[PDB]
C-alpha cells in the first residue's frame, strides 16, 4: 500500500530505485540520491545502511532537491516505513536526566521550544506512551531529526544522538 | 530481506504470487493457495483481506499442502511479516477474566496445557510484556491459532477470537 522512490539527480532525473517496504541497504543500487518521491504514508530514510547515520522523516509528497527534507548530503542507503498506531492517542514523558530521572513533564502537544515551555535545555531520557514522535535538535522543528517509535529511551544514544541536544518535538500525523 | 511465496496447486505447482512486505489483499491475483514457501523469517497469513478471518503462523520453510500449516481450506488473501524484537526477553501475563481481572499468572515459558499448569479452562484478557506469542485453541499447540504482537488484550476478541478458547501458548523464536 506504500512505496518510496529515490532518484540520483535533481528534479526526478536519472536512475531510480523503488522500495515498498523496509529496505535495509540499497547503496549498491544507487551511488547517490538527490530526489525523492513518496506516494503513500510516511518514511524515514537513513544515510548509511542498517538504519544508521543521519535520518530524515519524509511524509507523502515530492522532494525535488535534497534540501527539501533538510538533508545535508546526497548520501542515503536505507529507509524504513513508519507504521502509525490506530487510536489517535499521542502521549510522551520527557525527563531532565538519564534513566527516567529528574523533573518529568507529560504532554500530548507539539512543543516548538522546550526551553520556554519546560525550562530544559537538554533531555536525557524519554518514555513514549502513545503514538510516534520526532525529536528535533533546534527549536521550531529545525536541525537534526530523530525518530521515536514507542517503547522506552534511557539515554540519548538510544534514539540516535551523541549529545542530548533536543529543543523541539512534535507528533507524526497523516 | 524476507519474502513469502504462494502457489495455487499442491507441491509448488500452478500460478505464483510473491510478497516481500505486508500484503493486505491479493485475492485478485490468486484464486486459491495450496502451497507456501517462506524465505527467511516468520509470516502470518490470513484467510480474508485486511488481516481478518482465520490466521496461521508459518516460519521459514516449505509447505507443500495446506495441512502442513494446519490450514482448513485453500483460501488465503493477506499476510503480514512478524517482526521479532532483538531483546531475547519473552514475558506474558494471563488473566482469568476480562479487563485484566481475576486470578493472574506470569510466565516466560511455553505452556502446552493451561488447564494442568494454571488450572484455567479459559483466558479472557492478556498483557504481553516482552516478545511475541501465539495462542492455540487446543493443548499441545494444535487447533486454531492467534498472533499476539501487541501489549494489551482486554477481551478475547482483541486477539481475534469469538470464544475465550485458549488452552496452550508458546513464543515465536527464530
Residue numbers in the entry:
A (entry chain A), B (entry chain B): 5 to 178
Provide the authors' own sentences about this structure as they appear in the paper:
To this end, we investigated an aggregation-prone, deamidation variant of the highly soluble human eye lens protein γS-crystallin. The deamidation variant of γS-crystallin used in this study is an extreme example of naturally occurring, age-related deamidation and is implicated in cataract formation. This variant has a total of nine substitutions of amide-containing amino acids to carboxylic acid-containing amino acids. Via conventional sparse-matrix screens, we identified a crystallization condition for this novel variant and then optimized it for higher nucleation rates. We found suitable hanging-drop vapor-diffusion crystallization to be achievable at a protein concentration of 11 mg ml−1. In-chip crystal growth was observed in our custom crystallization trays after one day of incubation at 25°C. Notably, the total amount of protein consumed to fill a chip was only 55 µg, demonstrating that this method is suitable to directly transfer hanging-drop vapor-diffusion crystallization conditions to the chip format without high sample consumption. The γS-crystallin deamidation variant structure reported here crystallizes in space group P212121. The mutated sites appear to play a significant role in the crystallization of this deamidated variant.
